[PDB]
Amino acid sequence: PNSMKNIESLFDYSAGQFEFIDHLLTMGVGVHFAALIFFLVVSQFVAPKYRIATALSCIVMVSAGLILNSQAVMWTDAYAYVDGSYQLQDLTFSNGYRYVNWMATIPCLLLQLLIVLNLKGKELFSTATWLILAAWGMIITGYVGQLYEVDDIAQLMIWGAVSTAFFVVMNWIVGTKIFKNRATMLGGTDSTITKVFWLMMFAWTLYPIAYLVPAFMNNADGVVLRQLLFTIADISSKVIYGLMITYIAIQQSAAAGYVPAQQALGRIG
Ligand SMILES: *C/C=C(C)/C=C/C=C(C)/C=C/C1=C(C)CCCC1(C)C
Numbered sequence: 499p500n501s502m503k504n505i506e507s508l509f510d511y512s513a514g515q516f517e518f519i520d521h522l523l524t525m526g527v528g529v530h531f532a533a534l535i536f537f538l539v540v541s542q543f544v545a546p547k548y549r550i551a552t553a554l555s556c557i558v559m560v561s562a563g564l565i566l567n568s569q570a571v572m573w574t575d576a577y578a579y580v581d582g583s584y585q586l587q588d589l590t591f592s593n594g595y596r597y598v599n600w601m602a603t604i605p606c607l608l609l610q611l612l613i614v615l616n617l618k619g620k621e622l623f624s625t626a627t628w629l630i631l632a633a634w635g636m637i638i639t640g641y642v643g644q645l646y647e648v649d650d651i652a653q654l655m656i657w658g659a660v661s662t663a664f665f666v667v668m669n670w671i672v673g674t675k676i677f678k679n680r681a682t683m684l685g686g687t688d689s690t691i692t693k694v695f696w697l698m699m700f701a702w703t704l705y706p707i708a709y710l711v712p713a714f715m716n717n718a719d720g721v722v723l724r725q726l727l728f729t730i731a732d733i734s735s736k737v738i739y740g741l742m743i744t745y746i747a748i749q750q751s752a753a754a755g756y757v758p759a760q761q762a763l764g765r766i767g
């Protein structure tokens with residue numbers, strides 16, 4: 499459906515290129531589901547005020563892990579090794595599924611940051627609202643732009659610019675709330691949380707770069723690079739980010755007198 503609107507459909511792949519993509523996607527599944535079990539086990543050491551932040555990482559792990567799994571299966575469904583190359587057999591592969599999944603996962607990532615920032619009540623509700631709207635604005639417009647990556651690069655760029663406005667405004671909201679709420683943070687996490695900001699600015703910026711690959715590297719190796727970029731970006735923005743969020747949740751929990759948190763940190767000290 500969208501499969502012919504993505505540059506992946508244009509090319510035959512060497513076994514090397516094809517299998518590297520398959521393995522990237524598969525390693526990403528393994529990383530997400532491994533991290534899942536960690537987040538799960540460690541949630542008992544998080545105080546009730548913050549426990550939802552760790553639960554949101556579990557949710558993101560399974561959500562992203564399922565899309566990666568699905569991507570790996572669709573990739574192998576779409577191509578068969580015919581006459582010395584992987585050649586397109588049918589219209590099962592599209593990057594569109596990621597974009598659709600971000601509608602759920604980006605709001606989860608954002609919400610767990612707000613939680614550990616100690617926002618509550620009306621401020622939590624209003625901040626999450628504006629952020630989710632700005633995130634949906636960005637994803638929807640990017641989703642549309644990406645439908646033109648084969649036959650209209652100008653259109654890809656302009657939907658991209660529009661998506662970028664949303665991104666920039668969401669980042670402004672994120673950064674403002676981070677920098678204005680640092681002083682509420684317990685246990686030294688005032689310092690940790692600024693590294694979370696930077697990690698997000700880094701990892702999230704990789705996605706617009708992946709998006710632009712059709713404009714600067716429209717060939718089978720740009721297809722590989724795009725998946726590589728997604729892979730680096732997924733693990734950074736979801737796994738590493740989630741581990742830092744969970745660190746911050748446990749650390750604040752212990753500083754606030756939650757005994758299982760204290761015992762957990764004490765027994766790794
Ligand atoms: C786990 C997934 C995450 C954190 C996804 C993040 C996606 C973005 C920050 C996407 C950004 C885009 C632009 C700013 C412009 C081009 C279109 C997008 C949607 C790729």
Ligand SMILES: CCCCCCCC/C=C\CCCCCCCC(=O)O
Nearest residue numbers: 514515518722726729730731733734
């Ligand atoms: C921060 C997350 C790290 C992401 C892990 C990515 C793992 C692979 C890293 C480098 C491999 C580079 C070698 C690629 C050879 C390409 C083969 C080919 O395409 O012909």
Ligand SMILES: [Cl-]
Nearest residue numbers: 545546547548
């Ligand atoms: Cl609590």
Ligand SMILES: [Cl-]
Nearest residue numbers: 562599600603
């Ligand atoms: Cl996702």
